Paper text:
Transketolase (TK) (EC 2.2.1.1) is a ubiquitous thiamine diphosphate (ThDP)-dependent enzyme linking the non-oxidative pentose phosphate pathway and the Calvin cycle. It catalyses the reversible transfer of a two-carbon moiety from a ketol donor to an aldehyde acceptor. Transketolase has been used to form asymmetric carbon-carbon bonds in biocatalytic organic synthesis, where the use of β-hydroxypyruvate (HPA) as the ketol donor renders the donor half-reaction irreversible. A different library design strategy was used at each stage to guide saturation mutagenesis, including the use of structural and phylogenetic information, statistical coupling analysis (SCA) methods to target networks for re-stabilisation, and substrate docking. In the latter stage, saturation mutagenesis of two TK active-site residues led to variants, including S385Y/D469T/R520Q, that were active on three benzaldehyde derivatives, in contrast to wild-type TK which was active only on non-aromatic aldehydes.
Author numbering:
A (entry chain B): 2 to 668
B (entry chain A): 2 to 663
Amino acid sequence: SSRKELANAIRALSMDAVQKAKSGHPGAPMGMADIAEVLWRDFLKHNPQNPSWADRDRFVLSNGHGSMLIYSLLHLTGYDLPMEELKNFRQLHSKTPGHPEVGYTAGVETTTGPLGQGIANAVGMAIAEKTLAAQFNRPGHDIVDHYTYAFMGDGCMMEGISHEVCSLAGTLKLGKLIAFYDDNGISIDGHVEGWFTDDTAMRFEAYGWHVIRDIDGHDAASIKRAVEEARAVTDKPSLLMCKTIIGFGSPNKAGTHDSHGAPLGDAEIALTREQLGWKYAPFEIPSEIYAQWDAKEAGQAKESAWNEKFAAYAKAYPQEAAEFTRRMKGEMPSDFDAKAKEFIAKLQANPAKIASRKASQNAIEAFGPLLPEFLGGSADLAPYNLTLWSGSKAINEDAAGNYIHYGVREFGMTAIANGISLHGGFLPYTSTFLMFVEYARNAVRMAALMKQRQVMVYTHDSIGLGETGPTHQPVEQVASLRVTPNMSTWRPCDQVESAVAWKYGVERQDGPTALILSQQNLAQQERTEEQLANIARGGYVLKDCAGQPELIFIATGSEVELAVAAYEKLTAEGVKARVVSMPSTDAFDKQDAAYRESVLPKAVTARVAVEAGIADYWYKYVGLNGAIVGMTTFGESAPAELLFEEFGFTVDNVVAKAKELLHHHHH
Amino acid sequence: SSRKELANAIRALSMDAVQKAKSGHPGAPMGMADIAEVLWRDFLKHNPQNPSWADRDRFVLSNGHGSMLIYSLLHLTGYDLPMEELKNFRQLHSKTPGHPEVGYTAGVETTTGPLGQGIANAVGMAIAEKTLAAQFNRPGHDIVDHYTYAFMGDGCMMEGISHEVCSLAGTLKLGKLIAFYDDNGISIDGHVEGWFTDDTAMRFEAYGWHVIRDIDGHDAASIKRAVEEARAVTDKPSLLMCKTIIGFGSPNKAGTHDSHGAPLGDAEIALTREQLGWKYAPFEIPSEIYAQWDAKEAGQAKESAWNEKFAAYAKAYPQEAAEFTRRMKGEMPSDFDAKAKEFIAKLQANPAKIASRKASQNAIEAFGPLLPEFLGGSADLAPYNLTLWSGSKAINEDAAGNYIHYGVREFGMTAIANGISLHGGFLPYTSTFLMFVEYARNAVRMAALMKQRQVMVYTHDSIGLGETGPTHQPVEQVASLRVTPNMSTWRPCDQVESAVAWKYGVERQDGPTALILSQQNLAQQERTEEQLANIARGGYVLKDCAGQPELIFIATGSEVELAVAAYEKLTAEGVKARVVSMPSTDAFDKQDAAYRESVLPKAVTARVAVEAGIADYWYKYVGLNGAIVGMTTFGESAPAELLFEEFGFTVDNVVAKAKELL
Ligand SMILES: Cc1ncc(C[n+]2csc(CCOP(=O)(O)OP(=O)(O)O)c2C)c(N)n1
Ligand SMILES: Cc1ncc(C[n+]2csc(CCOP(=O)(O)OP(=O)(O)O)c2C)c(N)n1
Ligand SMILES: [Ca+2]
Ligand SMILES: [Ca+2]
């Protein structure tokens, strides 16, 4: 078989799988098949029999709608993705969902589809490789050495996140990142010149990339020469400008928007087979074509050689090797749990009224020596988010460091960190003011969807930040996080809940954790040993009465102090009241029914929520017969103490609103 | 007097107001003061006595933390912003909040602070000027002719949204957009070379901008020559690369991150006065410096000249001039309410089972001839969002058109449309798949904060979109919109509710409206005249019983049919059941309490919400003793019919959950 025939196997499988599903995207797989054949057969270092090989190259499909391209590649090269699964493309519980999903499918590195985020993930994978190589490689022992290859299209280039992450990739001189741009002139509205006219090569040169122009994306020799050129440039990420024809092979739909996102149709597929000279029936591949596509023997040889290298490394550097293995597996140090509990107990015994952003920094300082896998950063807010600890070292200064200055790039930061978590070897944390979670919002969602461990440090969480005013004062952002599937969100009320939340976040293996942290100092609360242990249950009884409470206050973060003051006033008047601290609604909801009943008993309807955030959220825990002391508006520019008074976060107002339930549930 | 003395008045007012507040940002106002002095005194066309003059130039401070720069300029040039307000910078209910806010302060064009969005707004204002000029100017009568000037810094340049909107500005050849980049080498983390190394001039030339490099931002002659050159380039937006020193004037904090975001301190202010040669006490400005800065006399002359031009236009083009005035004031045509009601009544009388995305297109088609102020578009999804009507004309093809191909740029699109609404003259609508409201989320928030009218057309709203799978299937996005202050969100259940929602959106005067639209066909519900009129109240009784209900279903959008099916089953068993359709929770919540009680009586606790979105939202209406048939997870890639079954959107499950309450 010629290279074109081998590439046409991808075209056939893609158009036929889309046709059988009556759904999906034939255009990009057909347009990029020749590029994929050269990259995967001539360059990609991988082992289909072990998709988790630590030193494999990473491939990312940023134009993720072209999912049949990667399913064809994985199937043809010998991964555990049988033809039956391709026949079940886009069907319930198949290993071939409409967009590729990490975990669903052997060999898929990331979940893509939302445009722009795949190239961001690839930038994170390349940062991870560079940093891990710098931390672990030793003279004569280069155990980390692999490339990151990405495909992307016009949509990814138009998205702002491409600017964020490719600018930063240029700064960091990511010489093992090689991206292929599917320059096919077509997007969904039609010919892109009506809305997309950038000199993209010049733009990427402005970022410090090595750009290869005018590659014939349907000519294997041209593509191969370009990839060799990119691999020879070791000090810059490379962009290959690949001129392709969307839907290549279809006489009537190639080069048209009609090939982008719908089945070609059976008549058109017959004509496409005739144009391509592809004789085989749908889902039929001859043994000779598998023989040229299969990567099991080469892959075995390469991983075997790497294992020999790693064994030599382990003999010369046994502690480093043990750390590499631990970190690539995502395992925690064996003594971490005990040391973290010792830290938390020390805080509970030694009160300090500090901002929870400072309590967060103190937890980073405490955990940092125990977690060399941290790869942390802030989006140009290190002095405000308090993300640096004494052991931080920026990777633009020393590549073996552990800290990233992300610049003013919140979305790019968060999707890069998704790439860092997907790579293995690190535990990323990211940070910005909470308001600007809105800039990064879909990357946060994607971390949750992909079940990735990442700690998101979001500071300056309410009107408590004061004079900066309503553009920066969060109101509804925490509610948005709380209703996100698989998101964990903590709003700690003091330095002890802050440390507990950080411990929870770094030990959470199957999804991300957002910390909602104050600008201003928070009072430490008294806790018994039992209460201290109950912080991690998300919601717990902090103050109580004998018998059934007449009133339960539910409070979070900076408002627990206010709720406790109201509880004290009411208790002194002879009212039976309880205070529940709710640092994490998601962790509380995961507790069993008996525990939740013990904290929020169904008999007690007179519930008062107190939080400087949007009020409507709290109907979930207060019901229709309680009260909510919350925000219902945007904030205002003024000193924070005047804002808390103006918006009702006062002991007198909280007590008055509570007493209306002693007056209403009565009358 | 001397231009440096005149610029130093901005420096003094800025450092002193920050010091008095013990809060704020002296650095960028001190760094950009010489640029501002040249722009405002020599070029900017404006009238302090009427900040709403239709043909004024628009100025945007995208690096909005530098708010004392714009307050100093407004005060010095004679706007209604007295010295007492500058002395009340960042104080409760002052006219000088920490970031500039449109409406709070005479002369402020937009609310900035979130980096990158000011330049986006300015691109929108320049698109509005270009389009309005093409629509209204006539030979001998150029009634629209003004510039859009923007200041921006490193943070705006790093943000992705700058790439989206400046790319599109190049495509649209916005020759009256002129941006000044405060190239001062400093951001909050320190010297920017550790994280920001772009050849920014080369980047902007890649967008098709005219770029002027190596301007000395502290030399009036350098700056003035650059502005003249940019104004002579009429077929490209221009970027002026202005080298400045942050905190210019401060001997110990100039050129450092220490001048970015905190008071300089009293000692350092004294040293700064010495270095600048500024001899005036805090909040002292001599009469001659006001005389040199004041723009009232020239401004009134220019606006009067324009009024005379407009009067001549109105004599030659009376209908066009009346349209111009109406649109610039943001008024609706006087017969729009009646014509839209006639359309809605027609739909109710002529049932159709269509997707609410199609019903949306049909409302655009009906309203299009009535609302020439539409300036609509989609982020590369016209064939899916259905944003084109028969009279759509793309502005990249015809500058006098009414449609924008925004490309794959959801955040930039939304903030550009905020600029369009701020400009006056237009009613923007934007569109993408609902999932990607998450890419644009803070610009949506900013439309609400700024009380701007924009209709946001979000289609493909649930697991009903099918095989595309969980990256695209919305679950929690509608709940996020619903709890945003001043946002209106509509999830119509058929073509009639879709038209009512569109009417509500275009008739809003003080905020945005999000339409949550289905991929798939939705059955039309039968309605009495009273029900039909009550759609606009956001929640209404769609199916009822005699007497107090025993069970109330609350449903939205594509799930109303499912709730009606469950109602029919329970009604046939003899249950006193009701179905409430809730297309807009915010419109419902604004109703009088007797109305809300008539729909959701407080004595009836057996309430079942049905919506293919996140369940947690609905506790607001069902409380603790009801049921919610909603989503609690991400979606899955499969045909939509199978997903609705898999996730419990079945008559059997809805009926079972209801019977658990009875
Ligand atoms: C952030 C985001 N916005 C919108 C979409 C919907 N969408 C999918 S592909 C596409 C444009 C297709 O353009 P391109 O990447 O050039 O596709 P191709 O040439 O591969 O078909 C759009 C708008 C998306 N997937 N992600
Ligand atoms: C989207 C967004 N992210 C973060 C911030 C916080 N912030 C305010 S100013 C700034 C950096 C200031 O850098 P630059 O624009 O270069 O400021 P300057 O030189 O004018 O002081 C940051 C990160 C913000 N306002 N908006
Ligand atoms: Ca394309
Ligand atoms: Ca700067």
